[PDB]
Every structure is written in structure tokens, then in C-alpha cells.
Design a protein around this ligand. Structure first.
Ligand code: HEM
Ligand code: HEM
Ligand SMILES: [Cl-]
Ligand code: NA
Ligand code: NA
Lengths: 713, 713
């Protein structure tokens, strides 16, 4: 059946903005997962999970009698897709049960693990999400085997369809680098926003880079991919060694024995894949990756035997039964247990990527410290496992249940508690009046608040106006934020704040985070007044100010907007057309196409553009909140042509006279070109739309201001 | 950017069920287009449209000074995509402004017509939809040029994204037959559900079949495509000759002069396409189809000149300036006006497809009759133009405004007015009790009501339980309806009705249409009681019974379900897998994926299957309303394999014992396989979901029973 994407494969795709509708959701419109989870008996779930660890099912028998290693793998893969570049992937939406992740080669046989969990999911129903249960299962596995975890938070609501994520451009699973759609260039530079070395892998190739079994060069890929998932060298060593303290790999014969991945399998498979023709197809004959490695002498118990072995033996290169490269300790006795036959024992083995922890000189220092001090290893691994499995859950205000760790970690971008009465409606009105009397303009007010709020991304729920981090390094110096103009605005707002707070009795005080947002509200209200309309923009106090010491500057770097179409801003020149980058930003801001449309057309005429650019400012009444952007953009009396200077900037000229009326970028003009976006712009550009434009603008403005306000959930 | 469609190009696509969400819609959730239109001043709009007809714009100068012909073509193409096979296409959603229809070759330069209407759309805003306006404009054109129309109804609400329609499998615009994805086979048999001869054409090729200029063979294509758009020979001749009484074609030089169609054009084109390098690119130099034909001596006025010319001259095959085949009148004087130069005149010309109306023996009889009796032609063309432009609008209850024709036409599938008091709540309870006392089973009651209601399709709003057409030819004889079982149920219900109605005072009476639905309600209530739940099913009276004479049996044939997954029914063997046909049916019923899921799992256990098949009946308590289908389908204790006798029927056996537990079809098992549908089934199959399943079932049951109830809208 030929489709629009076939005829026009380079057109912009807006359906990414309308995923997750109420249509696709089986839960009623008022279902609140946090309410449901809060009443779950978590300890009962964990008791059922403990029992499951050693209750083997004949259709996928448990290695060593214990599913713990499988389930730790399952949870590491659930969380391991996460990229810090855009916040996409991670465990927070339970996407491992959807395409494509459910059928990634690195997720082979995790379909069995998820099926083992169905009886418990079924038992507890809507009170525990699949997303939460994958992580919780991993924790219970660790606990069951003697490892004390750092805690657990619930609150990952289930999703009901695949997320739209760029995982690469390769059309072949697992394609080696350097092909026609290579994700590498230069000196092994991986393209942003990717965080894995090959299509369908979680991070790296266990045999080594593109299959070359060189531990030293494998360590380079490890470090780069793990960094791209927000983990440093200590956390990386802890996580790899910690995970490999348990269970085994599966390669009992040749890989090709496996059948079709779950999305390609027959209907009779009922959602399972990789059906194997090798012997029984399962248990002792299981084939997953094609490697056949067991790391420790007690694969079902926490130990310090991974580093005892790694350092205690010299390693030689060998091949698994499927022909994959792996390593063996030949001088060793057969001390490692067999998964099914009590009369069989085996020599220690390792992956190339395990040896990376000993043969990369930076990793070796850490590994040795963890070898000599296994309590330090246990603590680092507990903290890194928590971070891994929670990194995309957002502000601590979202964490549910009885096991949440009380320690506040720097990576959580923490927000201090508020311990004082908040401003009321009358106070908010008094502050808006003071802000407007200071001389700050509508442009200044709206630009500042947009810059503070518009760092949010819904992918990992980082960013937003809470914290007043716009005043701190590095946000205060980001070029998008216009640092000298920003410094002048903040100085004036901070004097307003000091004055207001100094006049209060009884503990009442306003944060700078709240004031920056309220001041943006006052700018919007004044722009509405400039256009002849009285509106009240909603405002919800309770944001707090974070310190520079509570702000990891390096981790903040990924939130810098290098393209923000809402401010007509492009930091440099990109491969991807600017309109594509607009829709990507809209998705991260959780906007629909209509909301993206209204918001951009208001921002244009409010003076939100970086540098006071005239591009897209299609109004003779700037700083008034009107629908002039749309009226002017859609006027057929104006003809548009790309400039000689720059093919991405366009001149709009009177069609009859040739007089220059306007200039725009691709972000501006796409609203007059793309057939769906132009249909939207026509609604807002109609004669009957002045009231709707203003109302819908204020609503989306408010939505953006509140994106991180999980304290008000 | 690789997507799920790329990796698994044959997987089932559910996003067709969640189009048209509140996400994509710019209007607020309570916007009611009918209310808005009802307050439009239609007379004012029509005066602005009359004015526009001769207000020539320089960027697309009007032929002969009058845009009428252009706008009649525009309207005829808006309506001309309609297929009776599935009800998809047509003018009722204004889809001409979206991909792909906005860029179909046959819609070349209709992007200019639509842009000429922007100032009017903008003026009236939300009170007139683009969908209604394209039709209205056509009507005004006709009127402006002297032709009295039969009427106009408003009420086509706009849509905000492309509809999902199978338009063919060809990967090349306009590909001639017999290619790798040929839409023809056999003795020029066009594949259902298609109604055009080439990809990107409305009906037929104006040069003749696959470009061969044979009027007699062209007539065959005309007759077949037009029949597939619900028009007979009389209506076809009246429409073709009526339309070609006006305007002209455009082929002033070679076609290749045209540039990119609108979805491929640069951003600076602002939504327009087919930019021509030939001379001025417009007006006297316009190039649309590549044909250069003007049919009459007065192309801006209604006349009788089309038939005068067609019969009055002998025709010679010639070539347009672009090399297309067309016809010129032998030995004629230059009597046809030039569109721009008052000093130039032209000989009469015709398309191959115009000559079809003279050289096909059936058409020639009609054409001669219209030639000899031009009042008969005028009336037929008015009626056929109304039908063309209204055929997908649904029941007359949807028609808005002051120009709706009072005459009821057979093609509208008319429903008689109700002229008596309706049954109230006490009466409905009394009738449900009598239904249940008669001995009618849950299975009978539910199957009958599903058969009556489930004929509805939202594409053209035909079908549904209003009318009691299930008792009439041909519905009563459809295989899916189980004709012998159906006749026994209707006999019993009709004695109930006669008795009830006989006992009433006043004019109170119940229709059989209402009773069939009320009886289904009672069976659902009894099934809930059988399961231990106390459930009342909503019911809305007011359906009326249509007569056999108000029911065109041939036009009804396209509503026969040849595939109905909800009854586990497939009439024959088809190319498209049964799960695909399930989702297609869901879409026509306007169901989301969750509603499709709940409804099928309930229907299975209520005994709605055709022939009392056990396929998918995964319960030990048939005729009780429970969530057993889901619980049992998701039980990993059961293993599924395709049968030896039939690869599309499956046996589910105990994994441990081998005992046969169930049998299922692909429609059944897809809910256990497809990753998104299995996610849905898991919600309904959970321990906490029995009450949610019952509730959700009753809601969707009721939605289906009310799909045609535009009298209640
Ligand atoms: C360089 C990074 C890593 C590499 C290349 C990697 C590689 C692999 C491979 C190839 C397998 C075998 C799959 C099979 O054949 O069954 C596996 C198993 C496993 N991995 Fe990793 N691993 C990495 C990091 C992690 C981390 C961070 C964790 C958890 C903290 C994890 C925990 C496990 C567990 C528990 C198993 C055993 C599965 C079972 O017993 O069924 N690994 N690893
Ligand atoms: C066999 C069916 C038909 C064929 C093959 C056909 C073909 C065409 C073509 C090739 C043109 C020229 C487009 C251009 O170059 O500008 C056109 C024009 C037009 N057709 Fe048809 N036509 C059909 C039916 C209809 C019907 C059913 C109507 C209306 C009831 C219609 C009304 C018009 C009008 C008014 C024009 C004039 C456009 C103008 O003046 O700009 N035609 N037709
Ligand atoms: Cl994601
Ligand atoms: Na994420
Ligand atoms: Na339709």
C-alpha cells in the first residue's frame, strides 16, 4: 500500500507530536498511576518475586536453578538504552516490551524473562507498571543473592506504543562500522545523539570493537558509550564488574540456530522470539549472544570473585562453541559450576570487555581498588545501579514508595525543600506590578522566562525553571540565553525580590525561580494589554533556588539548546533541516502540533528571538500579543524567495511592487509550507481567532512554565 | 533514520486507529462544527464567492475572466476520490488539502484554486469548513454561470491530518497497467477497493485506457470507475457532459515544464506546486494536464453546446502542444473563444473520454436523449451533481443550512420520520423482560444486534441499525448474518413488537429497529447476570423502520461484511491477512485499539461467532460476560501451533500434558502476538480488571449501537 512517507521520504513528520493520545490508552482518562502504586503492597510483590527467582519453568529452565542473573540483565537492558544527549531511552517508560527494543539482538531472550513476570504483573494489575516491575525485579534478584541495594523508587507509568527515537541509520542489524550509514566518522567519533557502537547493541560489542578482540581498544568504546549514558569511569567499572558477578552468557552452539526476533516471528509464538533448533533450544542448550562465559564460582551469590579471577589468572584468547571470541584462564583448575550438570565444572572465562577493566590503565586503578576493597566495590555498584535504573525518572518529587533513598545525589539536579509560606494571589499581583514598573520590557521578561523554562525535556524529565539554574554556571553563559542581557534582567529581578522579601513578616518569601516565571507571566499579561485585552496568566508558586554546589556543571551541558526554533536560534550549521529540529524540540517539550504552532507565532511577536532578529517577526506591533504572525505569514500578497547571501533565510516582498516586507528562516516559513502545519496556522490566522489565539497562547505558555512541577502532581 | 516500518514492513499498523486525536486537532475538545455552521450567514458567504468568480488574481489569472470552470473541477475532484467499496475518499473531510491528494497529478493547479479561497475562509473562520467551502464554491460557480443547482447541505467538519487510505501499490505516479504492482488483472479487472485506473488519477485517463485513444474502450473504464463511485450510466453521462459544458483544459507547452508537486516543492513555494518554466507559467501559458481542449462556444455560461458539438461534427485524432492525444472537429470553423486574446478563435475539440459518450452504444442513447431534451439533461446533471458532492455525507440528519433539498433520494438510504411517542424507561424494561422470557438466548440476541449495527462505516456514514434493514433484502440473506438463524430471531421479535404495539394507547409504538437493538441490550444484561454482575446497558430509542422500496439492494451490496473479525468470519480467502482486515473493520467502526480489543474479547465469550465456531471461545462459561478471553489467551501454560489441515487455524495445548485446550484463528491469536495489542490484552486479563472489562465492554457496545444516531447528535 504506497504511503505519503514513500512518495515524500524527506517531508517533516508530525505524528511524533501526537503519540500517546487518549485513544491508544487503555486506562480511563482519570487513571492516576501514582495513586495506584501508592496503595500497592510492595513487600508482597517482592516476596512473590523472591519466590520466582528459584521457581524454574520448563519452557525456559533457570540456570543454576536461579533466574537472578537473567533478571539483572533484563533490568540493565531496560535502563541501558538511555542517551544523555537527548534523554531518550532508559527504563522509565517500559519500552523494552515494544518494537524495536523488544527485538534488538542485544535483547535476545529477554522476551522469556518478561514472560516469566506475567503471573506477577497479572496478580497486581494496574498497581504496578511493567516499567516499575522490570526494575524492581532486578533489585529483588540482587537482594535474593546477597546484595544490598541502595533503594528503589516506583512511579514509572506504563506507555502504550513505541516511542519515536533515532537509533541510527543502518538498515542491517549489528552492521560493522564504516558502511554507507556508518554512525562513526573521523577518529572513531560516534554521531550524536547515539550511545552504542552498532545498531541493536546496548553499548559495546562484547568481542571487541567491530569484533576485534583487543581489550585495550574495547575500553575506548566502553568509556565513550558509558559517558554518553551519563556514567564516569568509577561507575562504569562498578556496573560492569557488579553485573558480571552474576549468571552466565549463552552460546551452546552456532548463533544461526536462532529463529526470527519477536517482531518477525509467527503468530503462534505469542510474542516470543529467537526460537532455537539447537538441541532442546533452552536451558543447557540455550543460545543468546553466542558467547559461553561464566564469570564466577558462585553465579547465584554476590561475591568478590569477578576481580579475584580477573586479576588472579592470565588470560588467553579462545572461541565459544559458536565461534565468538572470548577468553579463558588455561592455568586454572575447573572451579566454575555448570548451570545444569552437577558433575561438570569449567575453567574461568571472561569477555574481551571484562579484560578491558584490567588492561585499560585508568580502569585498572579502579579495578584494583575494588579488588583490594570489595566493600568499596559493593557501595559503588549499589549507587551506580540506582543511578542507572533511575536516571530518567526526573525530579525526586516523582519517586514513590517505601524504599526511596533519603540521600540526595548530585546527578538528580536537586531542588531544596521549601520550608516557608508561599506567595498568594494578591502577592503575585503586587510582584507583577513591580516587575512591570521596573522598566523591564515585554521582550526581556518573556525571553528570560522562556530561557529558564524551556530547558525541560520529557524524555528524562530533566531541566525546567525550578531551581533558578539560569542564574548559575553553565546556563547563565549559554549563547542562546544572551548572557549580558540575561545578567541585567536577573539583577533587576533580584532587587525586586530582596525588597519584597525584606518587607515580609511571618516567614513569607518568594524564590528567584518563582519570580523569573511570574515576571514572564507579567510580560505576557502586558503584551495582551498592549493589544487591547485584559488577561490573567495563571501562576503556581513553590519553586526553589538550587546552589552552584548543587549543580553539576558537566551534566548540565547536554541541556544547552543549540537549536531552539522558538527563539529562531541555531548555534551552528547542522545536517538536519531547522524545521526538523523544531519538531524535535517540540516533542521534548511535550507539545502537540497545535501547541507548537500557537506558541511559536506568539513568541515571534513578543520579541523572544535571540539577538533581537527580525526573522519571523511579522508584525508592526511588536510586544503586543496578537495573531499577526499567522495573518501576515498566510498573506498571498507577499512572495518569498531564498536570499543570495543565505539559502536558509528568505525575503518576503510585495508581489505587485517588489518592496521588501519581511525576512524569515526555514522555521518561520515551514508554517506556510507544510500542509498540516499551514492548516493549523490558518485557524489562528482567521478573522474570528483573536480570542482563541490569546487563550491558547496563555495555556501553552503556562504548560511550559509548569513542565517540571511534579511537586504539584 | 531507520524505523519499525523499515525493520518489520509487514507488521500490522495500529496508528490508523488513533488518527484524529484531540492532540492533532487545533479546535478545543467541545468545538461543535454543526453549531458554528448553523450560525454562519451562508447568503453572505455566497455573495463573496459570486464576487470572487471574476476577481482575477495576477499570480493565476482567470480563464475568460471567470474562475467558474476551475472551481467546478476543484469541487468535482474533491468529491471524485470516493469509492463505494469502503466509503473512503469523497469530499466530506476536505482531504484535498492534505497529502497525498493535494499533490496527485490529477489535482495539478487545484492548489491555486484553493489558495484563491483563502481570503473567504479567513473571513468566516471556523463557521465554514474547508470541506464545505470547496463544495459550496462549486455550487456558486454553477449558479454564477447560469445553472440552477438542486441544493446544498453544510456539515462536513474539517479534519487535521491525512486519512489512511489504500490508493494502490504502485511506486510510480500514473504508472500504466501491468507493472509489478498492477491494479489490473485478467480481463481488465480493477482490484477492489480501488476506483481509478492509474495511481494519482480521479477516475480514468483522458487520453484513453493506458494512453490509447480508443473512445469505445475508454467508455468501459468510465463505466467501471463511475460505478465504483456509485454512479450509473445516466448519472455518468450527465456529470461528464455537464462539467465539460464549462471551462477548458491546460496544455500550452510540454508537461515537463512543471516543477515539483506541492509536497515536494521548496519551502518558498508556500504550499503551492507545479511551478511552470513555460513562458509566463500561468494564464494563456498554463499547463495542467497537457491537453488543450475548450469544449463550448461560451465556456463561462451554461448552454446546450456540448452535445451540439459532440454530435454535430466528425472528429479527427490530433495532438495537443505537449503531445497528448485529443480530438478536433473535421472541417469546422473557428468558433470557440480564446481564454485571453479576443482576436483569437479555435475549432471545437474533445477528449477521447468525451467521445466515449457518443461511441459507446449505451452512452450514445442517453447522450442523444439529452441532446434532444436539454431540460432532461439539466435536471439529471443537477441531481447527479448533488449526489456526487453529498454521497459521503451520511444520513439526512447531518445536513445543515437553508439550502438542503426537501426531496428524499433513494441513494441517501432514507429513514422515515418518527411521528409517534417513543417508548420510555418503563417500556424498555418491560420489552427487555419479554425478550428474555421468549427463550431467545444471549448468543442469539447479541449476534442479531451486532449484525444490525456493525454495518456502519464512518468513511461515508452509511449503514448501522437505524432502518431495520437487517430484515430486508439483501442484509437478511448475507452469509455473515446467518440467514436461517436471523429469520427465527426476527420472527420472535416481531411477535413481541406486534403484541406491545397492540396494547398501547396514544400513538405509542416501538420500531423493529429499536427493538433489535434493545434486545441486544437485554442479552448483554443477561450475560452480565450470568457472570454475577448487575449491569444496566444504556439504550436510546428513536430508530425507525425503512421499507424495501427505500433500500437500494445493489448499493447495499458494498456494505456486506466479507470479513468480520468480531464474528470470527471470513467469507473467502484474501490476499491481506485476517488481522489486517480486523483493524480495517475497526477503523470503519470508528474504534480505537483498546475499544477493538475489549469488544472482540467480549463478543467471543457471548457467542457472537458465525456458525457457533469455538475458535477464540476461551471460556468454560459461554454466554457469561467475563474477561476469560484475555485471561486464557495470555496463559503461558498453553502452547499454540498451526494446524496441518489449515495454517490459519491454531491449536492451543497444555504445555505439560499435550491435551487440547482451545482452538483459535489469526484474529484470535493476534492479541497474544502483536506487541501493542498484547499490552492491551494484559490490562483486561489482569486480576483487578473484571469490572473494568465489563464497564468498558458495555461502553463500546453502546457506542456501536449508536454509530448512525445522527438524530441524537
Ligand atoms: C561493556 C558493557 C557490557 C557488556 C559488553 C556486556 C555483555 C554481556 C553479554 C554478551 C552477555 C551474554 C548474553 C547471553 O548470551 O545470555 C551478558 C550477560 C549479563 N550481563 Fe553484561 N555486559 C555489559 C555490562 C553489564 C552491566 C552494566 C550489567 C549490570 C549491572 C550486566 C549484567 C549482566 C548479567 C547479570 C548477565 C548474565 C545473564 C544471565 O545470567 O542470563 N552487564 N553481558
Ligand atoms: C471521464 C471523466 C472525466 C475526465 C477523464 C475528465 C478529464 C478532465 C481533464 C483532463 C481536464 C483538464 C484539466 C486541465 O488541464 O486543466 C478536465 C477539466 C474539467 N473538467 Fe473534467 N473530466 C472528467 C469528468 C468531469 C466531471 C464529472 C466534471 C464535473 C461534473 C468535470 C468538470 C470539469 C471542468 C469544469 C473542467 C474545467 C477546468 C477549468 O476550466 O479550469 N469533468 N477534465
Ligand atoms: Cl524513549
Ligand atoms: Na528517556
Ligand atoms: Na469517505
Amino acid at each position: 500500500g504506497t504511503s505519503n512517507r514513500d512518495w515524500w521520504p524527506n517531508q517533516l513528520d508530525l505524528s511524533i507530536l501526537h503519540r500517546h493520545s487518549s485513544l491508544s490508552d487503555p486506562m480511563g482518562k482519570d487513571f492516576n498511576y501514582a495513586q495506584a502504586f501508592e496503595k500497592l503492597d510492595l513487600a508482597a510483590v517482592k516476596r512473590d518475586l523472591h519466590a520466582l527467582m528459584t521457581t524454574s519453568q520448563d519452557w525456559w529452565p533457570a540456570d543454576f536453578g536461579h533466574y537472578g542473573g537473567l533478571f539483572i540483565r533484563m533490568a540493565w537492558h531496560s535502563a541501558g538504552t538511555y542517551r544523555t544527549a537527548d534523554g531518550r531511552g532508559g527504563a522509565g517508560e517500559g519500552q523494552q516490551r515494544f518494537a524495536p527494543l523488544n527485538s534488538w539482538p542485544d535483547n535476545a531472550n529477554l522476551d522469556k524473562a518478561r514472560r516469566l513476570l506475567w503471573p506477577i504483573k497479572q496478580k497486581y494489575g494496574r498497581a504496578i507498571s511493567w516499567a516499575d516491575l522490570l526494575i524492581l525485579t532486578g533489585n529483588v534478584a540482587l537482594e535474593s543473592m546477597g546484595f544490598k541495594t541502595f533503594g528503589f523508587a516506583g512511579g514509572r507509568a506504563d506507555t502504550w506504543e513505541p516511542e519515536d527515537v533515532y537509533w541510527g541509520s543502518e538498515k542491517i542489524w549489528l552492521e560493522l562500522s564504516g558502511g554507507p550509514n556508518s554512525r562513526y566518522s573521523g577518529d572513531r567519533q560516534l554521531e550524536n545523539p547515539l550511545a552504542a557502537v552498532q545498531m541493536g547493541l546496548i553499548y559495546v560489542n562484547p568481542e571487541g570493537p567491530d569484533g576485534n578482540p583487543d581489550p585495550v581498544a574495547a575500553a575506548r568504546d566502553i568509556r565513550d558509550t558509558f559517558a554518553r549514558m551519563a556514567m564516569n569511569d568509577e561507575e562504569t567499572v562498578a556496573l560492569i564488574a557488579g553485573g558480571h558477578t552474576f549468571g552466565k552468557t549463552h552460546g551452546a552452539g552456532p548463533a544461526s540456530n536462532d529463529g526470527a526476533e519477536p517482531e518477525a516471528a509467527g503468530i503462534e509464538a505469542q510474542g516470543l522470539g529467537w526460537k532455537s533448533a539447537y538441541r532442546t533450544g533452552k536451558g543447557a542448550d540455550a543460545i543468546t549472544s553466542g558467547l559461553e562465559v561464566t564469570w564466577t564460582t558462585t553465579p547465584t551469590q554476590w561475591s568478590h570473585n569477578f576481580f579475584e579471577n580477573l586479576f588472579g589468572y592470565e588470560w588467553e584468547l579462545t572461541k565459544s562453541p559458536a565461534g565468538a571470541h572470548q577468553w579463558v584462564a588455561k592455568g586454572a583448575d575447573a572451579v566454575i559450576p555448570d548451570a545444569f550438570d552437577p558433575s561438570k565444572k569449567h575453567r574461568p572465562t571472561m569477555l574481551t570487555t571484562d579484560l578491558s577493566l584490567r588492561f585499560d590503565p585508568a580502569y585498572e586503578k579502579i579495578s584494583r581498588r575494588f579488588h583490594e576493597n570489595p566493600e568499596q566495590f559493593a557501595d559503588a555498584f549499589a549507587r551506580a545501579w540506582f543511578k542507572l535504573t533511575h536516571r530518567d525518572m526526573g525530579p525526586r518529587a516523582r519517586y514513590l514508595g517505601p524504599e526511596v533513598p533519603a540521600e540526595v545525589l548530585l546527578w538528580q539536579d536537586p531542588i531544596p525543600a521549601v520550608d516557608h509560606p508561599l506567595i498568594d494571589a494578591a502577592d503575585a499581583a503586587e510582584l507583577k506590578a513591580k516587575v512591570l514598573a521596573s522598566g523591564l520590557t515585554v521582550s526581556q521578561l518573556v525571553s528570560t522566562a522562556w530561557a529558564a523554562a524551556s530547558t525541560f525535556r520529557g524524555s528524562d524529565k530533566r531541566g525546567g525553571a525550578n531551581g533558578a539554574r539560569i542564574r548559575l554556571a553553565p546556563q547563565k553563559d549559554w549563547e542562546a540565553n544572551q548572557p549580558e542581557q540575561l545578567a541585567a534582567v536577573l539583577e533587576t529581578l533580584e532587587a525586586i525580590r530582596t525588597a519584597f522579601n525584606g518587607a515580609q513578616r511571618g516567614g513569607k518569601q518568594v524564590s528567584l525561580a518563582d519570580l523569573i516565571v511570574l515576571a514572564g507571566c507579567a510580560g505576557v499579561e502586558q503584551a495582551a494589554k498592549n493589544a487591547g485585552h485584559a488577561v490573567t496568566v495563571p501562576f503556581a508558586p513553590g519553586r526553589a533556588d538550587a546552589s552552584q554546589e548543587q549543580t553539576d556543571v558537566e551534566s548540565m551541558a547536554v541541556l544547552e539548546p543549540v537549536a531552539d526554533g522558538f527563539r529562531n536560534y541555531l548555534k551552528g550549521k547542522y545536517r538536519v533541516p531547522a524545521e526538523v529540529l523544531l519538531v524535535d524540540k517540540a516533542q521534548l517539550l511535550t507539545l502537540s502540533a497545535p501547541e507548537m504552532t500557537v506558541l511559536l507565532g506568539g513568541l515571534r511577536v513578543l520579541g523572544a528571538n535571540v539577538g533581537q532578529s527580525r526573522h519571523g517577526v511579522f508584525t508592526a506591533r511588536e510586544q503586543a500579543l496578537t495573531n499577526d504572525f499567522f495573518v501576515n505569514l498566510l498573506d498571498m500578497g507577499t512572495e518569498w524567495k531564498p536570499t543570495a547571501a543565505d539559502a536558509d533565510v528568505f525575503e518576503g516582498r510585495d508581489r505587485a511592487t517588489g518592496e521588501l516586507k519581511w525576512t524569515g528562516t526555514r522555521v518561520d516559513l515551514v508554517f506556510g509550507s507544510h500542509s498540516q502545519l499551514r492548516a493549523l496556522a490558518e485557524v489562528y490566522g482567521s478573522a474570528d481567532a483573536q480570542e482563541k489565539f490569546v487563550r491558547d497562547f496563555v495555556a501553552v505558555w503556562n504548560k511550559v512554565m509548569n513542565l517540571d512541577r511534579f511537586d504539584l502532581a
